[PDB]
């Protein structure tokens, strides 16, 4: 049948100069860590030590500067525009917040994305955005973010946003969080661990089984962080939609092997990231 569109996602893309570095290696999407200040305002794109094996953990930007950089990379006509870059996952490091600041964090995130990435709707960046929350109890972040875009008069930008819960929670617990949040679509499900440690496919398989079921709630599944060809083959064989990596050219190489090329292709802006593949 049709080839499954795949997001090849550059990992830990936290400096503006890295956006081109990863896209030029074959990434059509990136993941970026977002730190918060004491007031739940996104502050830096910063991970810190420890991080993935082989990487510098300390590159960072003021979050709004990173957004302006991402805006340039994703706005047609800009000197820096990368047509290939279609999705950003923000790994929201809400662990530094109290649980009762989750909703505030979502409003401040929306406020900054509207201002600096979507340019108040004036020729904004065009990538789809996934808000990845590490703790199921921080689900009120989603409400906060939607309510802020609505207050600011741009509720339609929610069409460009989707959701993930990154903490490797049991799939039924994740679904219960989305039911609490009133969310029923635009759901990605991460599964993974640092490239420094081993991991199997059992939870990826559970997530894929949910995605492919008639009654499931997941739209896309992505596996992280994968730096080896054999792991990439295993994940594609398991039917994931996305693979996060420190080496986009490694994943591109596998996808260009003749057996995989018949069955997968690199996602473009044509491909809606909230739609389950069939
Ligand atoms: C930066 C303010 C933008 C507007 C934010 C609207 C939602 C505010 C939620 C309560 C935030 C309380 C802490 C405010 C910290 C600050 O920005 O000075
Ligand atoms: C399984 C984890 C889901 C998130 C925890 C949210 C807090 C639970 C209580 C929220 C209100 C109860 C409800 O709406 O059923
Ligand atoms: C949040 C989606 C999954 C992202 C993996 C990034 C890991 C990290 O920052 O340690
Ligand atoms: Mg991260």
Which residues lie below 8 Å from residue 195, measured CB to CB, with a gap of 6+? 52, 53, 54, 225, 226, 227, 246
Structure-block tokens of residue 267? 């996602």
**Ligand 3: residue whose CA is nearest its atom 7:** 194
Which atom from ligand 3 is nearest to the alpha carbon of 134?
1
Return d(Cα 204, Cα 103) in angstroms, integer: 29
Return d(Cα 185, Cα 181) in angstroms, integer: 11
Which atom from ligand 2 is nearest to the alpha carbon of 180?
14
Provide the sign of the torsion angle of the four alpha carbons 143, 187, 15, 246, taken in this order.
positive
Contact predicate 60/52, CB 8 Å: no
- Alpha-carbon distance values, 156 to 71, 114, 121, 148, 152 (Å): 18, 11, 10, 12, 11
Ligand 2 geometric centre to CA of 146 (Å): 19
Give the domain ranges of the chain.
1-278
DSSP string computed for the chain = -PPEEEEEEES---SHHHHHHHHHTT-SEEEEEEEE-TTS-EEEE---SS--TTS-S---EEHHHHHHHHHHHTSTTSTT--TT--EEEEEE-GGGS-GGGHHHHHHHHHHHHHHHTSGGGSS----EEEEEES-GGGTHHHHHHHHHHHHTT-GGGGGGEEEEE-S---HHHHHHHHHHHT--SSBEEEEE--TTS---SHHHHHHHHHHTSTT----EEEEE---SHHHHHHHHHTT-SEEEES-HHHHHHHHTSHHHHTTEEE--TTS-TTSPP-
Burial of residue 177, with CB atoms counted within 10 A of its CB: 0-12 exposed, 13-18 middle, 19 or more buried:
buried
CATH architecture of 1-278: Alpha-Beta Barrel (3.20)
Q: How many CB atoms lie within 10 A of CB 106?
A: 27
Q: Name the closest ligand to CA 177.
A: 2
Cα 208 to chain centroid distance, Å, stands at 17
Structure-block tokens of residue 211? 């995605």
Q: How was this structure determined?
A: X-ray
Contact predicate 62/41, CB 8 Å: no
- Alpha-carbon distance values, 27 to 72, 88, 204, 264 (Å): 17, 11, 21, 15
Structure-block tokens of residue 269? 């802006």
Provide the sign of the torsion angle of the four alpha carbons 213, 219, 225, 230, taken in this order.
positive
Return d(Cα 180, Cα 198) in angstroms, integer: 32
Among 122, 121, 196, 191, smallest CA distance to 159 is for: 121
Among 167, 134, 130, smallest CA distance to 145 is for: 130
Any ligand 3 atom below 6 A from CB of 30: no
**Ligand 3: residue whose CA is nearest its atom 4:** 91
Contact predicate 247/8, CB 8 Å: no
Ligand 3 geometric centre to CA of 48 (Å): 12
CA angle, 112 then 118 then 124, to 5°: 155
């Amino acid at each position: 049948g049709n080839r499954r569109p795949i997001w090849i996602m550059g990992a830990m893309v936290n400096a503006i100069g890295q956006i081109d570095e990863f896209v030029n290696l074959g990434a059509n999407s990136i993941e970026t860590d977002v730190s918060f200040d004491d007031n739940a305002n996104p502050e830096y794109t910063y991970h810190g030590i420890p991080c993935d094996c082989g990487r510098n953990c300390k590159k960072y930007e003021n979050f709004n500067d990173f957004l302006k950089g991402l805006r340039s990379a994703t706005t047609p006509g800009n000197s820096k525009y990368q047509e290939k870059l279609v999705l950003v996952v923000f790994d929201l490091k809400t662990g530094s917040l109290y649980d009762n600041q989750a909703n505030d964090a979502g409003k401040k995130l929306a406020k900054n994305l509207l201002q600096h990435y979507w340019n108040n709707g004036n020729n904004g960046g065009r990538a789809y955005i996934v808000l990845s929350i590490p703790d199921l109890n921080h689900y009120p972040l989603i409400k906060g973010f939607k309510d802020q875009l609505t207050k600011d008069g741009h509720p339609e930008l929610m069409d460009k946003v989707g959701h993930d819960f990154s903490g490797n929670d049991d799939i039924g617990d994740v679904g219960k969080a989305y039911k609490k949040a009133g969310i029923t679509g635009h759901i990605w499900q991460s599964d993974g661990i640092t490239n420094c440690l081993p991991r199997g496919l059992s939870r990826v398989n559970a997530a894929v089984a949910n995605r492919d079921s008639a009654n499931g709630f997941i739209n896309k599944v992505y596996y992280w962080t994968v730096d080896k060809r054999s792991t990439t083959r295993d994940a594609l064989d398991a039917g994931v939609d996305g693979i996060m990596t420190n080496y986009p050219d490694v994943i591109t190489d596998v996808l260009n092997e003749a057996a995989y090329k018949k069955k997968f292709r690199v996602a473009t802006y044509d491909d809606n990231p909230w739609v389950t593949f069939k």
